[PDB]
């Protein structure tokens, strides 16, 4: 907690004690590797919940899927060793990172036909049964999220390993909606206030009044941001945060911006986003009262790839709010084409 920090912007050296908030969201986010707690507890948690009537699992975070994508070989071994008529198949997932209606639970009485290590070898392929258990994926038709579990895991208190390629995880003892507080941070030092986790880099700055400045997402989760890590979280209206509360937006006054309301219908369906306040290339925004009312966000390029030049806003504030994704440059709700339909 004590060390020396060099700052390029201030051209000075900071030496002392305190807390350093690592970025861990740009430049090859490393590592948050994957291994859960003892396998028998997790293995016993599937068929016990399957007896209740569960059908699938959703991942609250993008990386939680990569837990399953490399562990599914292991559970298939133990359930077959326990002659369980079930199968586990994981797949790809895309925003919005959907959430189920229920969750797993102990039953801490685990299976009595399992080993202890988590790195066993000599994998043997198993068969497929008529009873199939799904994982998060494009399966929104056969089984809805009502019969799907979500937010059933939690980061172990001793599960923090940054150099050791592993992070211990345990299942929660109760149902919850908030995100994992164990790997979570927020800070502010006299010019900037940053809320951060493995996926979010919500950053706010002060020019004349405290306001949001930029944000970066590698995932769009659905767990509510806990108030234990929220700066200036009093008297905040739910209709004014730039990032919606449903998408893990921090309930705070630093999530504010004059002239803009909540972006409940932004292009969040893209997996990655970059929120800032500038102009999309080749576009101009002019303040006028006769521009159309706010609606769904519009991509700056049409279906033919042609660019839309002129735009209008009713009561926005320059520079306009725009998004950087894999699709181009999306404007906010309060920005509409000046003459294009």
């Amino acid at each position, epitope marked *: 907690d004590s060390g020396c920090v060099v700052s390029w912007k201030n051209k000075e050296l900071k030496c002392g004690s305190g807390i350093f908030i690592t970025d861990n969201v740009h430049t090859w986010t490393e590592q948050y590797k994957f291994q859960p707690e003892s396998p028998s507890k997790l293995a016993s948690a599937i068929q016990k919940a399957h007896e209740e009537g569960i059908c699938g699992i959703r991942s609250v975070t993008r990386l939680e899927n990569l837990m399953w994508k490399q562990i599914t070989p292991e559970l298939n071994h133990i359930l077959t060793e326990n002659e369980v008529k079930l199968t586990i198949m994981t797949g790809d997932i895309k925003g919005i990172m959907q959430a189920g209606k229920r969750s797993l639970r102990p039953q801490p009485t685990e299976l009595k036909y399992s080993w202890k290590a988590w790195g066993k070898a000599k994998m043997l392929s198993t068969e497929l049964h008529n009873h199939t258990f799904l994982i998060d994926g494009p399966e929104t038709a056969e089984c809805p999220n009502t019969n799907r579990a979500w937010n059933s895991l939690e980061v172990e208190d001793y599960g923090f390993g940054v150099f050791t390629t592993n992070i211990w995880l345990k299942l929660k003892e109760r149902q919850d909606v908030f995100c994992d507080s164990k790997l979570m941070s927020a800070a502010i030092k006299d010019n900037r206030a940053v809320h951060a986790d493995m996926g979010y880099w919500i950053e706010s700055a002060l020019n004349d009044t405290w306001k949001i400045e930029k944000a970066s997402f590698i995932e769009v989760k659905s767990c509510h941001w806990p108030k234990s890590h929220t700066l200036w979280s009093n008297g905040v209206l739910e209709s004014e945060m730039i990032i919606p509360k449903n998408f893990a937006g921090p309930v705070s006054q630093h999530n504010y911006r004059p002239g803009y309301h909540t972006q409940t219908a932004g292009p969040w*369906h893209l997996g990655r986003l970059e929120m800032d306040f500038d102009f999309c*290339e080749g576009t101009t925004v002019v303040v006028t009262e006769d521009c159309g009312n706010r609606g769904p966000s519009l991509r700056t*390029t049409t*279906a*033919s*790839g042609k660019l839309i030049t002129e735009w209008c806003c009713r009561s926005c504030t320059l520079p306009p709010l725009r998004y950087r994704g894999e699709d*181009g440059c999306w404007y906010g709700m309060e920005i509409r084409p000046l003459k294009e339909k």
Partner: antibody
Framework: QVQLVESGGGLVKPGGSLRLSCAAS????????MSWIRQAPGKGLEWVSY????????DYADSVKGRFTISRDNTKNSLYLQLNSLRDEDTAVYYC???????????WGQGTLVTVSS | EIVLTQSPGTLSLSPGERATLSCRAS???????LAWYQQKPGQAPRLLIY???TRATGIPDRFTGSGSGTDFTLTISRLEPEDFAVYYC??????????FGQGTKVEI
């Protein structure tokens, strides 16, 4: 009429380099997305790369990351692609097409052919 | 990935008939964003549907695009000897693959 003219294709040694240019006319070049599409002999069409209007997106295909470079010049309505570190499977007919991976393609013109062998 | 599938790989018919195509989709295309391209061997590809339902400019009426959801059919009402070519289907958003369709051969 939208005319797309390209030049630069030819036989080159593996590990060499090449430059492909696209000549646009008959439409607002500085208003549409630009992209390059290749087609292996007797195989299906595959995306290569595309560039934005202000040249700020510049996304590249997975197998050519760091080996290809794409650029445009809106003043003279010219689109450029740079070939570097060419390998054996790069032999394909490269089409200069007015499009974008997240959009349909409106204009195609006489894509050139490049061969990478001895 | 919503990589598409084209069936059948090739089609055999005669002039005067009425042909149909099929571009299977992985799941749930968005806003019916599908297109059809004609590859007359050997020339540059053309554009038929934007659009999945709307004929492109300069295209004869016989080319009809239809289908919705996860199944799409490109149907030519009237056969014609020059129409024998290779047709490709492409989904644009979101998020499209890095390659086009496999194509269907139309043979006499």
């Amino acid at each position: 009429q939208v005319q797309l003219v390209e030049s630069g294709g030819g036989l080159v040694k593996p590990g060499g380099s090449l430059r492909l240019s696209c000549a646009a006319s008959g439409f607002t070049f500085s208003d549409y997305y630009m992209s390059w599409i290749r087609q292996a002999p007797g195989k299906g069409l595959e995306w290569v790369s595309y560039i934005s209007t202000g040249s700020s997106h510049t996304d590249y295909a997975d197998s050519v990351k760091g080996r290809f470079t794409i650029s445009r010049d809106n003043t003279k309505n010219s689109l450029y692609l740079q070939l570097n570190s060419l390998r054996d499977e790069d032999t394909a007919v490269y089409y200069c097409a007015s499009g974008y991976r997240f959009s349909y393609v409106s204009y195609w013109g006489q894509g050139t052919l490049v061969t990478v062998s001895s | 990935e919503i990589v598409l599938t084209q069936s059948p790989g090739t089609l055999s018919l005669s002039p005067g008939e009425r042909a149909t195509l099929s571009c299977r989709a992985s799941q749930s295309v968005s806003s019916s964003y599908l297109a059809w391209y004609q590859q007359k061997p050997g020339q540059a590809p053309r554009l038929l549907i934007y659009g999945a339902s709307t004929r492109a400019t300069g295209i004869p009426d016989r080319f009809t695009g239809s289908g919705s959801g996860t199944d799409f059919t490109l149907t030519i009402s009237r056969l014609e000897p020059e129409d024998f070519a290779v047709y490709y289907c492409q989904q644009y958003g979101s998020s499209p693959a890095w390659t086009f369709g496999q194509g269907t051969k139309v043979e006499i």
